[PDB]
Each structure stands twice: as structure tokens, then as C-alpha cells.
Amino acid sequence: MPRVDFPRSRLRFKEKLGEGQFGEVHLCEVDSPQDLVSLDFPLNVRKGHPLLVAVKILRPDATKNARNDFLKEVKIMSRLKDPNIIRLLGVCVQDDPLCMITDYMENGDLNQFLSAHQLEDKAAGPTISYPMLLHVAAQIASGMRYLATLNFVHRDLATRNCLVGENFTIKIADFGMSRNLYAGDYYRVQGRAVLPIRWMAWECILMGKFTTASDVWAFGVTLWEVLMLCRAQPFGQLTDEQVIENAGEFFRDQGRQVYLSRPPACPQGLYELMLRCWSRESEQRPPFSQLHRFLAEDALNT
Numbered sequence: 652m653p654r655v656d657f658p659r660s661r662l663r664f665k666e667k668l669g670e671g672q673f674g675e676v677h678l679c680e681v682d683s684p685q686d687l688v689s690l691d692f693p694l695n696v697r698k699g700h701p702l703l704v705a706v707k708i709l710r711p712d713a714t715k716n717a718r719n720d721f722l723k724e725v726k727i728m729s730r731l732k733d734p735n736i737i738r739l740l741g742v743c744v745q746d747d748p749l750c751m752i753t754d755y756m757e758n759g760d761l762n763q764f765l766s767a768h769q770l771e772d773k774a775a776g777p778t779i780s781y782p783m784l785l786h787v788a789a790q791i792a793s794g795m796r797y798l799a800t801l802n803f804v805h806r807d808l809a810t811r812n813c814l815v816g817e818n819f820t821i822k823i824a825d826f827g828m829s830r831n832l833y834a835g836d837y838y839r840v841q842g843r844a845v846l847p848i849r850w851m852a853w854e855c856i857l858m859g860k861f862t863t864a865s866d867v868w869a870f871g872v873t874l875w876e877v878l879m880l881c882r883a884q885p886f887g888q889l890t891d892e893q894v895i896e897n898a899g900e901f902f903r904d905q906g907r908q909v910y911l912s913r914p915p916a917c918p919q920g921l922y923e924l925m926l927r928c929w930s931r932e933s934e935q936r937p938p939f940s941q942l943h944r945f946l947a948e949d950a951l952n953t
């Protein structure tokens with residue numbers, strides 16, 4: 652948790668990024684950021700380039716429940732310091748309105764980004780190479796490796812929750828179901844609670860057991876998305892109820908559970924890596940440290 656508030660007066664509004672029931676998110680430029688690096692604000696300045704940030708701000712009439720949610724979000728983010736996890740650059744909480752300041756990631760979420768690209772075919776819109784797709788996936792695995800060392804379970808890892816900056820940089824975040832774009836990826840259970848069942852390991856669906864090992868299962872599905880260039884939903888031909896049935900077949904283990912198929916042009920050894928992420932026994936799934944090393948090496952030799 653920061654020792655001091657970010658100085659509100661240094662935030663120069665530029666545009667609205669998004670709007671919600673109890674707050675807004677604004678794109679802002681920071682005046683003279685070099686002054687603030689000396690005070691342990693984690694700002695990365697260049698020379699002739701302005702410093703842009705995203706600022707989430709509570710509305711002055713926000714309910715008590717919304718203020719509670721905001722304060723807990725600040726607490727969680729204050730712990731996480733890694734190049735591939737979204738970063739809390741500062742807060743304004745000594746007075747109202749409450750603010751949190753994060754990285755500005757100009758290329759949007761990774762689903763939006765990959766849906767706008769085509770795979771490069773060097774043997775023959777904007778394109779992306781197979782090595783770069785592996786570099787993207789390696790960055791996701793490195794961020795999850797960090798969360799694993801803190802014993803922090805993400806519970807909703809997917810491309811829609813990864814953000815893209817300059818030079819193909821990736822940072823993991825969590826937007827939940829708060830944007831209306833991805834409602835088809837969530838299954839409603841109890842009341843307002845929803846579950847991203849197509850990314851969830853069998854023990855999450857049947858018993859609600861969420862662990863780092865189930866984050867590895869979700870990473871397998873996320874890797875499948877990346878190699879599909881986000882062109883199709885996992886198990887797209889099957890209903891939500893059929894995906895839940897499949898979790899039951901993993902539990903019964905009588906050889907009738909089904910798997911995501913191998914993406915077009917996906918190397919066989921890489922499909923086998925996904926399959927290991929979907930092992931029935933959580934202790935047989937690979938750890939994030941091993942997934943990172945594997946993908947980083949292939950990114951350089953492919």
C-alpha cells in the first residue's frame with residue numbers, strides 16, 4: 652500500500668475510456684512525471700513522449716456497497732508487482748472521490764487484438780507471426796508463475812482478461828463480466844453469480860475447488876484461444892449444459908470425456924502440452940514455471 656496519495660492536480664484529462672453504474676475510467680496525461688519517479692511511483696518515462704495512465708474514479712453518489720468493492724480492489728492490486736500483471740501506479744484515497752491509477756494499454760484486451768489479426772504465412776490486414784503468438788503465451792505463463800508464488804488463484808484466466816500494450820507486451824487483469832461483451836462465456840448459477848465454465852477444470856465445475864492447478868487448466872484453454880487467433884469459442888458446438896456434463900465424464904473416468912481439438916497449424920508437441928494441462932489429476936498438470944520455460948524456448952527457435 653502506498654505511503655502517500657498520487658497528487659490529483661497532476662492528472663490531465665484527455666478522454667473517457669469507459670462508464671459504469673458507480674464510476675468512470677478516464678485516459679489522463681501526467682505533468683512532469685520525472686518528479687514522481689524519485690518518490691517511488693512506478694512510472695516509466697521516455698524523453699519526447701508523454702506519460703499516459705488510466706484512472707478509475709468513483710462517482711460522488713456511489714453506494715456504500717460500491718465503495719466497499721472499490722477499497723477491496725485497491726487492497727488486492729497493491730500487492731501485485733510483476734511486468735506481466737496489471738500494475739497499481741497510485742491511488743487517491745485520503746479524500747473523495749476515490750481513485751486508482753493503472754497502466755494504459757492502448758491495444759485493448761487480447762481477444763479484441765488477436766481477432767483483428769491474421770496469421771502470417773511467410774511461404775506465400777495486419778498479421779502476426781507464430782513466434783510472436785508463442786511470445787504472447789510465454790508472457791501470460793510468466794505472469795501466472797508470479798501469482799503462483801503468492802498463492803494467489805486468478806479463477807478467470809482467459810484472453811478477454813489479458814491487456815495488450817506497445818511492442819506486444821501483455822499484462823493479466825480481471826474485468827469479470829462487467830463490459831457486456833462476453834456474456835456468452837459465463838453461465839449463471841446462484842443469484843447474480845456467474846461462472847466461466849468453458850475455461851474451468853472438472854473439479855471447479857463439480858465441487859468448486861479453485862487452485863493454482865485449475866489456473867493451469869484455464870491456461871491450457873487460453874493457449875488454445877491464442878493459437879486459434881480467438882476465432883471461435885471453446886467447445887463452440889456444445890451447449891453450456893453439455894460442457895457441465897463433460898466435467899462429470901472427467902470425474903467418472905470411463906473414457907468418454909472430450910477435449911478441445913488441435914488448432915489449425917498447431918504443432919503436435921504443443922497440442923500435447925495443452926493436453927497435459929487437462930489431466931484429470933491436478934498433480935499431473937505442469938507447473939507455470941515449466942510452461943513458461945517451454946514456451947519461451949520455442950518462441951526463439953520457431
Ligand SMILES: CS(=O)(=O)N1CCC[C@H](NC(=O)[C@H](CCC2CCCCC2)NC(=O)c2ccc(CNC(=O)c3cnn(-c4ccccc4)c3N)cc2)C1
Nearest residue numbers: 676705707724727753754755756757759823824825826827
Ligand atoms: C467477483 S471478483 O472478485 O472476481 N471481480 C469481478 C470484477 C472485477 C474484479 N477485478 C479486480 O479486482 C482486478 C484486480 C485483481 C486481479 C487479480 C488477478 C491478477 C490481475 C488483477 N482489477 C483489474 O484487473 C483492473 C483494475 C483497474 C483497471 C482500470 N484500467 C483500465 O480499465 C484500462 C487500462 N487500459 N485500458 C484500455 C486502454 C485502451 C483501450 C482499451 C482499454 C483500460 N480500459 C483495469 C483492470 C474482480
